[PDB]
Write a protein that binds this DNA or RNA. Structure first.
Lengths: 196, 167, 183, 125, 120, 106
RNA sequence: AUGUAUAAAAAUAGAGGUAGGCUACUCUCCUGUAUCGUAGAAGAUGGGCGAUGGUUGAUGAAACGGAAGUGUUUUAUUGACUUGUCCAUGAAAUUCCAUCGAAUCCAUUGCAUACGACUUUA
RNA sequence: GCGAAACCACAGCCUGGGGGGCCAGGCAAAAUCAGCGGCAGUCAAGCGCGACGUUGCUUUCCUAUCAUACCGAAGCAGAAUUCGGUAAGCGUGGGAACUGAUGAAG
RNA sequence: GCAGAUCUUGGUGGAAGUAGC
RNA sequence: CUGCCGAAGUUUCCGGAUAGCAGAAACUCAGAUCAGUUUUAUGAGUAUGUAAAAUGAGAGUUUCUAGUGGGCCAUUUUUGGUAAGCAGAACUGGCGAUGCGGGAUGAACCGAACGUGAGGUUAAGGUGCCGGAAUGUACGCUC
């Protein structure tokens, strides 16, 4: 029920082909989608499942000026950006104008650390997948194919959490003051009969 | 849905045969126009009274007398295979004979991919004793100390604010 | 079925904890931590026992139920009784050199069939190996984690592994004979 | 802590015509169906499935397959109603049912309510 | 044309040799340098003893073909600082020193003698 | 600006179409908060618009408007099927409309 | 675009908080149909009762924030806005919706070279 | 400096599928220049035949490795040798616009 | 009564300031 | 330029015929005069043909006059066949003259035969995105 001018979709625990279809419609709907922690997306099937499904895609290049062949991008962000590129009519004028509304990045840059991060309840792994199934993590997968920036982001994201954790306790200590002040306002308890 | 129909019938009486015999069937049919079509199917293969000879006398529904009581049904099936040879005995645990044969069809549609006309049900008896139930899993939903957590949980409106509890 | 339960009585070990999806099995000899991600199985504590349950599943997951029951029991044997194994060496003409370093972690092995190849056998984390003094050409390795202990000696068995010769005539080598608890 | 499916387990119909009524399970017939009843006579006895119901933590002692009056007899003695209402789960869901009968002027009177409530930020500085 | 690692055959961009990789170091090591700059004087030759055991000329006298490189003392004038990003290696701050010679102030300019020489 | 907005935010979705034949005389509109073809019977008949901003200014301002109404529900997800006095331009896919609450019957 | 309101984290065969010295007990989750603010001749001009509070502007700032610090916090000081509550005058015939510095040519150079360019100097 | 002519449906990227155009894809920036085993018989699984059995004679690409790497097996003490496996990367059994050099522009 | 006949006559293009003297 | 009617594409003899299909007038009969049809009855060795019931619909005669005896397939018998296809005879339709929705684009597949438009409702086929429509409901399957 959201028509935000910009939405931020934290992607840990989602599926790739189901989030890329939810997002692909909201791009054509006119929104402005940012997908952070794209590195911690999931794919049904075990670790080698998409691994040969993408090592096969590396064997596919043009046979004329092989610097003009397919550009097999290795970043976890562009893995999913590829997924939202065939879902859109990217050969029209409405496709290539929709794609510039999507900003798919890994980790969380500070311009989106301090904002709300909604999730999609129709693409999540703990819902859509049977318990005890085989699943592979994209950012853990694409590192084994060439994305050489794994040890930095896992270090960087660890620093952001403890800083955000420090942000949370100050926020948690904030409403504990208003928890007292909410019932301390006596009007709440005798005029809760309007449902509130 | 399904609705079990009591069907009886005979042939046209002649001077040679003043009183034809009456034949009762308890079969299952989503409506009544397929009951009185399946009825002439079974009776043609067994009693050899063709559709150009016989007539239909009475169709009635059999509502289950105790739909609120749990039961177990042993199900005798003659299945017409691609070699056309299968007698089958299968047990289902539910409340209504209408509801069992729907589940009977569904399972039979999965493991053995049976169609409508590929199945001729033979006999349906409400099996009652606990020592005659010959299935392991049906037996285990019948011990007094049964228990399980909920399976297949999932508790529009896309873009949920927080994580689902899923507990 | 709808249930598959197997419970092993928890001994006097310090911890039979399974909190936070990890096997933090601590006993009298020490503390051991292990990941509990073998399979999504119900580890339920009941007083002086820990019950392993696999409710409403098939055999593919049910076959792994007894593995964790053994793995915890294997961890229980290491936490309570420990593990102590003795490996026996065989020398005929050229004795095989063996030097325990880093508290017996770095095993400097040489002179295997008189070879000049320096065989360094790094022990697994948590296991201490030593040359047994009662019987010559015997190496006694003990530790809490039997899996790390057993794989290390097998690696030691794979360290001086004979190759490029007939196994019949050339028969002296590194072998494992004693495999038992530390208590 | 984990809740289960028992005999006599109190449940809550979440998807149906009786959505939100406290009902109690009676007999388990399968892994997907069951036998369910409630003392509220507007709720007939019937077979709810587990995909359109949510468990409740409150459990109650009852033998197998009691008739409806005995369900009511055991319900009145072990007072499941107003034991459910004691929980914070019931507080929100019941208040969800009051905050949806609110007309325009009453939903305007709550504006006054929280305007009488907002200036109570005078706290221990 | 068989060494495809050096294909394609197009001319270089920078007349000066650009260093691409840098050696892996540790914080336990003392601070030291890696690179330098020199000039191609020319090729020459020498004679030198060989203290190399196991060779066919062990403890002998062998000619060696060599190259002298003209290397002046080298002027450091400031630092640049890199932060590590998921997008690579960005430079955060460029801090120079106070004073520069005209020679390095000729580097920023195309016509130093014509212009106002007002760099830095 | 919270003492305003007597309409409901919407988004023009697409023309009426089949796979290959599109019917630009009737639009598809997705109202906010309308998530059932039985909950779309409330917005049947309301007078929707499409407000935008041209460059050249006529009659002392710049904002122009295309009116229209809502005719049918459309599908099982709470979209509707609208009809405008001038057909909406095809370069307004995924734009924003306003579903004015009149003619109100509630 | 008509509010341009909302930043723990992890897990789901689980999670966070509650005494106490690392625990036991208790509580919370199981949707945000929540929280947050919202009246004023486009938010009028006055008076009273309650309060040291809320609100935003001009700053002087200080602490911070580097993965794109596109920002956060503490604010002295100054000021408006103070509906916090209660009373006084105005609105309308829009009288049935329309909204100076560099660089290049020419010159110079040879490390470069088919023309271009590149490299020097000026 | 003078200065044609042939020719001219409109044309100009590749892969796959029914060619330049169709469908689905890869992509896509101006403006230019120089190279370019069978037969007979006995059985008998089983549904008159009947299986395994038994008796009579007669440039580049591709692994399917030719060596190099690594192992397995063998009367393999060692050397040397045979068989088998991974293995076509490089060597020593088969298939068949492209690269340069300028160039404006957020 | 013209779109067409390697259509008739006339006029003018791209190839190109290329081929070339 | 527009409108109306509109085929055969196989014979039967000898390129000429006759018939057929499409047509124009004259002149018949409102009847049992018919009918790419189904009944009942007679026979005939479930099928075969014959006559008078159902069902629909107005039928008929000649005269004078164009085009047309190509084929591509799909249907089932079918004998000759065999490593393996297949070769041939007969029946029925389409297409030839036909656009339109699907079948990703395709003439032989599934629906459907067309004046100009508005509004509704469907066939085939579909409802995660490209793509208009359920990330619907139910039960069982699969690594």
């Amino acid at each position: 029920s959201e028509f935000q001018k910009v939405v931020v979709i934290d992607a840990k625990g989602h599926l790739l082909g189901r989030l890329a279809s939810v997002v692909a419609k909201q791009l054509l709907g006119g929104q402005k989608v940012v997908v952070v922690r794209c590195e911690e997306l999931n794919i049904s099937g075990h670790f080698f499942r998409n691994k040969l499904k993408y090592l096969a895609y590396l064997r596919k290049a043009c046979r004329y000026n092989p610097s003009r062949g397919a550009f097999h991008f290795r970043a976890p962000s562009r893995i999913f950006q590829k997924a939202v590129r065939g879902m859109l009519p990217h050969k029209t004028a409405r496709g290539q104008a929709a794609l510039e509304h999507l900003q798919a990045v890994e980790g969380i840059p500070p311009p989106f650390d301090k904002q709300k991060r909604v999730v999609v309840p129709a693409a999540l792994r703990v819902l859509r997948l049977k318990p005890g199934r085989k699943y592979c993590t994209v950012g853990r997968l694409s590192s084994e194919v060439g994305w050489k920036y794994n040890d930095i982001v896992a270090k960087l994201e660890e620093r952001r959490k403890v800083k955000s954790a420090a942000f949370y306790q100050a926020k948690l200590a904030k409403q504990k003051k208003i928890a007292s002040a909410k019932e301390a306002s006596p009007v709440n308890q005798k005029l809760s009969q309007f449902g509130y | 849905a399904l609705k079990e129909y009591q069907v009886v019938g005979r042939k046209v009486p002649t001077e040679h045969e003043p009183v034809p015999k009456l034949f009762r069937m308890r079969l299952f049919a989503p409506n009544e126009s397929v009951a009185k079509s399946r009825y002439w199917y079974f009776l043609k293969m067994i009693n050899k009274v063709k559709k150009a000879t016989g007539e239909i006398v009475a169709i009635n529904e059999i509502s289950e007398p105790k739909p609120l009581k749990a039961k177990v049904f042993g199900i005798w099936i003659r299945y017409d295979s691609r070699s056309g040879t299968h007698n089958m005995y299968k047990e289902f645990r539910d409340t209504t004979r209408v509801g069992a044969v729907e589940a009977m069809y569904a399972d039979m549609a999965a493991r053995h991919r049976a169609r409508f006309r590929s199945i001729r049900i033979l006999k349906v008896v409400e099996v009652e004793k606990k020592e005659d139930v010959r299935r392991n899993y049906v037996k285990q939903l019948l011990n007094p100390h049964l228990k399980f957590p909920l399976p297949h949980r999932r508790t529009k409106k896309v873009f949920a604010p927080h994580r689902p509890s899923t507990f | 079925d709808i249930y598959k339960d197997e419970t092993l009585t928890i001994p006097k070990g310090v911890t039979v904890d399974i909190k936070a999806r990890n096997v933090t099995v601590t006993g009298p000899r020490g503390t051991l931590k292990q990941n509990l991600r073998h399979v999504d199985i119900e580890m339920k504590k009941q007083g002086n026992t820990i019950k392993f349950i696999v409710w409403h599943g098939s055999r593919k997951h049910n076959a792994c139920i007894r593995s964790v029951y053994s793995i915890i029991n294997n961890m229980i044997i290491g936490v309570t009784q420990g593990f102590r194994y003795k490996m026996r060496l065989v020398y005929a003409h050229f004795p095989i050199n063996i030097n325990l370093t880093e508290n017996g972690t770095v095993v400097e092995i040489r002179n295997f069939l008189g070879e000049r190849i320096t065989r360094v056998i790094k022990c697994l984390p948590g296991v201490t190996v030593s040359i047994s003094s009662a019987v010559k050409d015997e190496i006694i390795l003990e530790g809490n984690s039997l899996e790390n202990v057993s794989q290390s000696a097998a690696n030691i068995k794979q360290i001086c592994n004979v190759r490029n010769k007939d196994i019949r005539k050339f028969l002296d080598g590194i072998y494992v004979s004693e495999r038992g608890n530390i208590e | 802590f984990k809740r289960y499916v028992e005999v006599g387990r109190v449940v809550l119909v979440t998807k149906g015509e009786y959505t939100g009524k406290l009902a109690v399970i009676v007999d388990i017939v399968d892994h997907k169906r069951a036998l369910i009843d409630s003392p509220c006579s507007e709720f007939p006895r019937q077979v709810i499935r587990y995909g359109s119901v949510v468990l409740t933590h409150i459990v109650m002692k009852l033998p197998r397959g009691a008739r409806s009056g005995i369900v009511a007899k055991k319900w009145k003695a072990q007072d499941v109603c107003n034991k459910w209402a004691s929980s914070a789960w019931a507080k929100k869901l019941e208040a969800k049912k009051v905050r949806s009968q609110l007309n325009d002027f009453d939903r305007f009177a709550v504006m006054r309510l929280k305007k009488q409530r907002r200036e109570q930020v005078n706290v221990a500085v | 044309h068989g060494s495809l690692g050096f294909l394609p055959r197009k001319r270089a961009s920078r007349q000066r040799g650009k260093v691409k990789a840098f050696p892996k170091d540790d914080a336990s090591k003392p601070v030291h340098l890696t690179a330098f700059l020199g000039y191609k004087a020319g090729m020459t030759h020498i004679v030198r003893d060989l203290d190399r055991p196991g060779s066919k000329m062990h403890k002998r006298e062998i000619l060696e073909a060599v190259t002298v490189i003209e290397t002046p003392p080298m002027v450091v004038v400031g630092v640049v600082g890199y932060v590590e990003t998921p997008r690579g290696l960005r430079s955060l701050t460029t801090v120079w020193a106070e004073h520069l010679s005209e020679e390095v102030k000729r580097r920023f300019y195309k016509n130093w003698f014509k212009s106002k020489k007002k760099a830095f | 600006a919270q003492g305003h907005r007597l309409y409901v935010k919407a988004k023009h979705l697409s023309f009426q179409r089949s796979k290959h034949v599109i019917h630009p005389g009737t639009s598809i509109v997705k109202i906010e908060g309308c998530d059932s073809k039985e909950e779309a019977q409330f917005y049947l008949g309301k007078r929707v618009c499409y407000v935008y901003k041209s460059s050249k200014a006529v009659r002392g301002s710049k904002i122009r408007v295309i009116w229209g109404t809502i005719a049918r529900p459309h599908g099982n997800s709470g979209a509707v099927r609208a009809r405008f006095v001038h057909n909406l331009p095809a370069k307004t896919f995924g734009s924003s409309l306003r579903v004015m609450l009149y003619p109100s019957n509630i």
